[PDB]
Swiss-Prot record, chains A, B:
Forms a beta-barrel structure that accommodates hydrophobic ligands in its interior. The keyword Secreted does not apply. Higher expression in adult small intestine and to a much lesser extent in fetal kidney. This is Retinol-binding protein 2. One of its GO terms (molecular function) is molecular carrier activity. GO terms for cellular component: cytosol; nucleus. The keyword Iron does not apply. Pfam families: Lipocalin. The gene is RBP2.
Length: 133, 133
């Protein structure tokens, strides 16, 4: 069958490291790329192809209870150990990540249909906005 | 509202570069991480939270017609210019990527409900298998 239409979800990827190395892809890209999974959407009409490709990485779960301090290794990030405490301030979910970094934590809250997340470390603030699906 | 349940799809991400830099994340990780979009699935029961996070990157489209040579800049990979020719060999879709790299190309075919992709460059072969969704 020459009909390759569909959404295709990568189940295995063998020797992507060697292929990328043969293409002179640099070390630090290869270390990340080998952890990705790819989804391939093929829209084919006769001999006309459109290929659409998204690469995905599942991050480490986080489970916690508000008010119960917990140990967190930030493996998706800087891979440091912190002691996280999540509390409510009104409807704002507030987390302090005690550890090497000063003023490290985050705040999470809903407004309308958007979820706001503010990450802080040192004098830096990163503001993320999410839409509900 | 303290109910943060849902699937949440990142719409914006401001100063992730500075936050990651404050965490001493290395240059080449930061260059990739700033191109990601995150999807956050929150399962919340009272004050028990489970956070599940997937990071996604949309790659460059590829549109072609079998038998019609086309120019391809491999921006998702090594960012080289190749002249790609895609032909059928039976039900196997065969692509030669003429350019600097010797023996560069790929083969794509279906078997059952799986799509097989073999990437080649030099003496290296990378074998990918996809499941239909």
């Amino acid at each position: 069958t020459r009909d390759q239409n569909g959404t295709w979800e990568m189940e295995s990827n063998e020797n992507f490291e060697g292929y990328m190395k043969a293409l002179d892809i640099d070390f630090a890209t290869r270390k990340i790329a080998v952890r990705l999974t790819q989804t391939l959407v093929i829209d084919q009409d006769g001999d006309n192809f459109k290929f659409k490709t998204t690469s995905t990485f599942r991050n480490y779960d986080v489970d916690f209870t508000v008010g119960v301090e917990f140990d967190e290794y930030t493996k998706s990030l800087d891979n440091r150990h912190v002691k996280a405490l999540v509390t409510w301030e009104g409807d704002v979910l507030v987390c302090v990540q005690k550890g090497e970094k000063e003023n490290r934590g985050w705040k999470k809250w809903i407004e309308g249909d958007k979820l706001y997340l503010e990450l802080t470390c040192g004098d830096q603030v990163c503001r993320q906005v999410f839409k509900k699906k």
